[PDB]
Symmetry: D2
Subunit: 277 residues, 4 copies
């Protein structure tokens, strides 16, 4: 339904994107804060946050996460800061889990292992359980990341076992990873229906990597889904035309939502939908 409020998430930095490809990539807490302000003004209500060292290397340092979180909340106190527990491929699970200790409002929870480009993004079943238990210990709301159909079933089993008790649960379909399910329209339609069958009360969002950004976004617009965009997932505005800011990508989605009459969620509505109150 294209009248339910739309939540836009900006995945502004990520762990893979470089300035070789996207020179406008925000790397420092100050750059991330400036980008978060422009994204919030463009319509984003959530920042999906990865941090980097000054040299651009991915980081898991708690004091660096605090620096970025502080800089963003000082410029836009209303935005929801969602910490990544995914980090860079190959990072140790202990370093990935530890920032839950900063007690953010929300953080991601990756629901399975998959080949990821030339490497493997590992989420051992015992570590998924350890992380789900840590979400309860640190009192953080999860965004559950799903890259394949089978990950929805795996999450439904963790719900049945009482390991994931978050209700309503927010699921993010991450489509277009080389090794994961693509963002073709048939796949997004299949995933939302599959999720409705297996976890009927779950809410959902979609992140369309690269070329899949536009097809996933426009389908989510008219099916009641929420949308993630940003340099972490896609650096192009048009084929061969880099976007000049994460805010440009957010603003296009907000303009399309305005065209079709789908309202953007207020910060209050975004916290209500995602059960962050």
């Amino acid at each position: 339904h294209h009248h339910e409020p739309l939540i836009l998430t900006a995945a502004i930095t990520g762990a893979e994107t470089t300035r070789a490809d996207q020179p406008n990539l925000p790397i420092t807490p100050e750059e991330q804060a400036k980008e978060a302000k422009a994204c919030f003004e463009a319509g984003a209500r959530v920042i999906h946050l990865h941090i980097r060292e000054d040299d651009g290397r991915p980081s898991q340092r708690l004091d660096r996460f605090q620096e970025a979180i502080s800089a963003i909340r000082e410029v836009v106190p209303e935005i929801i800061i969602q910490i990544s527990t995914g980090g860079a491929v190959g990072e140790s699970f202990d370093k990935r889990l530890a920032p839950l200790a900063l007690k953010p409002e929300m953080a991601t929870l990756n629901a399975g292992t998959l080949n990821f480009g030339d490497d493997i993004f590992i989420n051992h079943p015992a570590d998924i359980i350890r992380l789900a238990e840590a979400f309860k210990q640190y009192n953080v709301v999860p965004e559950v990341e799903v890259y394949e159909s089978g990950m929805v079933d795996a999450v439904a089993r963790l719900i049945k076992k009482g390991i994931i008790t978050q209700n309503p649960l927010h699921i993010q379909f991450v489509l277009g990873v080389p090794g994961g399910m693509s963002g073709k329209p048939k796949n997004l339609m299949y995933m939302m229906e599959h999720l409705k069958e297996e976890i009927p009360t779950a809410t959902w969002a979609v992140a369309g990597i690269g070329r899949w950004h536009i097809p996933t976004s426009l389908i989510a617009m008219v099916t009641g889904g929420h949308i993630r965009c940003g340099f972490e997932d896609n650096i192009f505005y048009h084929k061969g035309v880099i976007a000049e800011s994460n805010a440009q990508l957010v603003a296009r989605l907000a303009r399309i939502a305005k065209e079709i009459g789908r309202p953007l969620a207020t910060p209050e509505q975004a916290r209500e939908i995602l059960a962050l109150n």
Copy 2:
């Protein structure tokens, strides 16, 4: 694919819409010409044409069709004028077929019978064959209208029997009629896949009646489909806000196509895709 040229059709008048509900409805040839020019400038490449008497009653008069066609050609000679052979529900089949004698570039060919609101839109199998023979007699390219899954199979059988020889064939999915298949995303995805299985070389467009205009349009945008809009099908710009003009509906679709980088077909490209050149 959202890189293939987009053909926008404006169904500007129709047989059911009234001036009482939509005061901006073009009824006279002069009003239809003014609307067609504004629609073409907004991005439309096809006008789906029904005619009316000055009092708003649906008409099948050949002089009135000639007047509307000439008035539109006078101000926008590049637009494709597609005559309706559907007309008003209950109209005699003889009166529905006769305007093909005007040798338009294109005309609609309804592929089956269905309950339509409180009445029945009748297309007897023998009359569908008579109409297909008249299209060939007057060298008119059809737009085959389908309202249900079974109409695709019925068209595939007419192709197998050598009754429909148009190649490539252009199919329009008309979704949202009370009595026909709705325009929900699941249905449009099903129909394009069903059509690919049964008539692999067919091209397609979608008309989303009323509330289905936005979901059908945005799915067609990113799946390579073409789109029909207009007062015949939908009088609202937003929920509860009746639109200013057909051009206002066309312009929104053109702006969304520009946002996502899907080019609008030139008149030459539209004629090539629809095999009118």
Copy 3:
């Protein structure tokens, strides 16, 4: 789920099938009673009944329907006798409605109009309402016949208007009619999912005409659906091999259900599922 009880319906005679193609076709009430007993023993719990005159002509005579109903009830009182309100294409709606006055446990209710072979099977919206009101008047439970996606929506609107109050409602997908939706696996999967979305509490069965009998039956077996078989819909046991009787077609489905461990509904369970108690 392939463990919920399976209801088998035998459509033993119909209005189209001839003795010239199928010499085992039961035509008289005595032949229909003998067939119904053999079908019940093979696993059928419902008889879908059309009647014929002694010369094989389709009939709508109430005395002839009473004779067939009484003959079947005398030899197999546990079977559910479902009378057809569809009859032969082109029959008057008054003659089609009249047998509801015999107060059968169940009867079919055709939910829309469609081209049917070279003719049109007409179900005017006002007549569908008249029929649905007559079902309630005579305390007859309907089996709602749907041939296309749009007919599910039309039934959902009759439920919303309080015209169809039957809860749970039993829908039968009639697939493979020339002019209607085919019985290909994609279509049956689409229809059960479409029905779950639009009428969530409805139960369903499938009738796969001719070549579609086996694909529809095996999909329904493992998706919790119920199945109709019989000479009305298909006269062949294998491609080009005429069946010996309706009981032969029923027995195969019962054997497949036994193989996979799906229990056959007892007469008591069939009446509970179809809300005939």
Copy 4:
């Protein structure tokens, strides 16, 4: 439901235990006896894992040769497909080496996934190494797919010329805890997804545990081929342990006979799977 049906019997596997399934064939002679009964019941392919006498999964070349020779002797016409999957946690080097035995066919796992409490690892560089060995040893692969994304990954290996097999045989392995389930919606989605991404590919389905019956009956009427057996499912009915792999094969053959779908002859199975 008229195109010939190929039935594969996955008779042993690496996970199933004798305690849960006392009829589990473990030794080459037990595997040969089972393969003969399966062939007579309608199987045209044996999906083979080997075990040591103590039931532990094995990768020993002499043990694979013993099992292959024993099966070959009792049923020469059956297609022996060796597993390159082996047991979860087995080294990739040990998993690849049996291709040197030049079997008629072997499995090629197309991706990594969580698998029960562990992870079934197929590193992208190892998938490439394995696909290259298939070409060098002139072995026809059966490509194992557990998720939608693995179809796309296989399409990319075809584009890169790493997989040159044409037509390519894909097996959907559905119902693994961690992988895509075998519900009817999923099998319908996968066959359509495969037709879109690899149009000339043929396919089979393996429905683990509770998914055996739904996957089998959908494949029966959609032209797909079917895998059954103790590796994937030990029950004949819910809570009723199966008596042999041949019992599971025979049920599928009886259902195929009921609906008039012919079973592939050994010659037809080799033609469809391009083993000639």
